[PDB]
Scaffold this active site. Structure first.
Site, PDB file in Angstrom:
ATOM      1  N   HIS A  13     -21.445  96.059  21.604  1.00 44.48           N
ATOM      2  CA  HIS A  13     -21.694  95.643  22.982  1.00 44.48           C
ATOM      3  C   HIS A  13     -20.505  95.893  23.922  1.00 44.48           C
ATOM      4  CE1 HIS A  13     -20.163  91.315  22.227  1.00 44.48           C
ATOM      5  NE2 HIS A  13     -19.738  91.486  23.456  1.00 44.48           N
ATOM      6  N   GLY A  47     -13.750  87.463  26.525  1.00 46.96           N
ATOM      7  CA  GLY A  47     -12.636  88.245  26.001  1.00 46.96           C
ATOM      8  C   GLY A  47     -12.367  88.023  24.508  1.00 46.96           C
ATOM      9  N   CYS A 101     -14.705  88.207  22.128  1.00 44.35           N
ATOM     10  CA  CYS A 101     -15.653  88.956  21.300  1.00 44.35           C
ATOM     11  C   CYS A 101     -14.913  89.957  20.399  1.00 44.35           C
ATOM     12  CB  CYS A 101     -16.725  89.633  22.149  1.00 44.35           C
ATOM     13  SG  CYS A 101     -17.641  88.486  23.212  1.00 44.35           S
TER      14      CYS A 101
END
Lengths: 300, 300
Positions: B41, B143, B145
């Protein structure tokens, strides 16, 4: 977002942990520049710990009595001294993995990360608070003595704690890195007592702000109160008295949540007087006092 | 001794964390050998996340669209692919700080350490459990992830988790390092639901053994019970059903404490049926299910 008790990353400190042996006795040390810091009770047997004269025990030891092992690799000891309750072993080699560091004496109610060790090997890291009676509630088996506490800011490590002992009651005492004990404790195996352990009020308030931010706010009430009247209730439940200093430290959290400090004090009052009634706040069935206002901001 | 929730030392993993950017989108990656692993993603905008076709989005991207930054120093991307929900960016440089590692798919009820990051910088470490519904209850801001979970054994790091998303309910979902999600979750911004979160029974029993070891044992009762009859009570309180596997895993703790597993199950039964009545166990007013039997042994 969510909300966890969270230690600093420990890698900067892993690189400084060593084993120190002197007789049978082995424990953890901290290698910074060309100096190893460890608890002075490394020179004691179990017998000596009842009534140790640290001068006279150390006077029997020369430089070669201390065996400093860093992983596989032994350091040469070219100087020893005792500063308060820490031993400062001067070594030949500067540690290549020395971070930027300072030594800081923290105040009660402040938090830090602990790296728990065994024979100069890190095994575990956790976040804790220095209690109002200068004890900590830790995990420390035999061999953990000289395990260290720290805070990290930028890439500066501020070393604030060295573990020395478990008291008869199973709580923990230790020093700063200048070797002064926190609290009235001495490095001897006698019956020593901590005072009453109170709750760190400002940390509780900080945590309630963390709760609000995360969407837990059943505990928010209609009432407000005064500083003065809040403290009368605090006295009865063994909470630390709240000051104007404390109010000011909460101001950023006040600003973010739209809730005034005294309104939060009133929420807390009612939780003290009525309890939590079986409900939880941020998955806890007790009031947590182990996050400072700074910690809540850092995380939020 | 005392008893804390305790993460693994994070230094081995600190050395593998990098930033990956692709468009505006920046997130954390893991640099192992000459490969960077990150959530796929990273190639999505906020707009794309409603209904992303990951094939077609990735087909627009070439090698030079990915900006991998390791501290100050940029890596050259010489190959990209998608394995399940992870992106495998092949880079020019082998990571010098690569530890010995494996990738492991863990089972629900197992625990691990999480290093929470922001722009390839570690900020915090904590111990958590994979819940029975395959969620975790974490701390993850924007941030974070591609923040990673691990266990350490000897000096082998076993990487078991990569953070992908916060679900509408504020709990967290993610993948193994092969990019298969834990649970039925997908990497898209739709209304996704976890099942009922049950309590991890075997972990509770382990913690009660930890309590006994530390001297907390007001909860020990006269009664015993059966596996069969224990599970009927477990059903009613949303506890996971206990198996013979579980009984066997507790055998070392049984051996050390002198208490049989079924006698401990009977203690627990009564805590479920009567509650803790305001008292605490190892400073907690709830039953903790976030230590495995292995964790209690490691610590004890």
């Amino acid at each position: 977002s969510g909300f966890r008790k969270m230690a600093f990353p420990s890698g900067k400190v892993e690189g400084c942990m060593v084993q120190v042996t002197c007789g049978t006795t082995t424990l953890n040390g901290l290698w910074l520049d060309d100096v190893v810091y460890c608890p002075r009770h490394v020179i004691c047997t179990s017998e000596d710990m009842l009534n140790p004269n640290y001068e006279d025990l150390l006077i029997r030891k020369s430089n070669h009595n201390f065996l400093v092992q860093a992983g596989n690799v032994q350091l040469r000891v070219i100087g020893h001294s005792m500063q308060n309750c820490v031993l400062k072993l001067k070594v030949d080699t500067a540690n290549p993995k020395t971070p930027k560091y300072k030594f800081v004496r923290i105040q009660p109610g402040q938090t830090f990360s602990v790296l728990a060790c065994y024979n100069g090997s890190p095994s575990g890291v956790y976040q804790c608070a220095m209690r109002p009676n200068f004890t900590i509630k830790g995990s420390f088996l035999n061999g953990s003595c000289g395990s260290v506490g720290f805070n990290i800011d930028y890439d500066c490590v501020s070393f604030c704690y060295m573990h020395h002992m478990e008291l008869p009651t199973g709580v923990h005492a230790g020093t700063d890195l200048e070797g002064n004990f926190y609290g009235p404790f001495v490095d001897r195996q006698t019956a020593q007592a901590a005072g009453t352990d109170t709750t760190i009020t400002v940390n509780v308030l900080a945590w309630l702000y963390a709760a609000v931010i995360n969407g837990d706010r059943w505990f928010l009430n209609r009432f407000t109160t005064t500083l003065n009247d809040f403290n009368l209730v605090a006295m009865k439940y063994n909470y630390e008295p709240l000051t104007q200093d404390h109010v000011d430290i909460l101001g950023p959290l006040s600003a973010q949540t739209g809730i005034a400090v005294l309104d939060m004090c009133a929420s807390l009052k009612e939780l003290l007087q009525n309890g939590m009634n079986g409900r939880t706040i941020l998955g806890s069935a007790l009031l947590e006092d182990e996050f400072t206002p700074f910690d809540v901001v850092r995380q939020c």
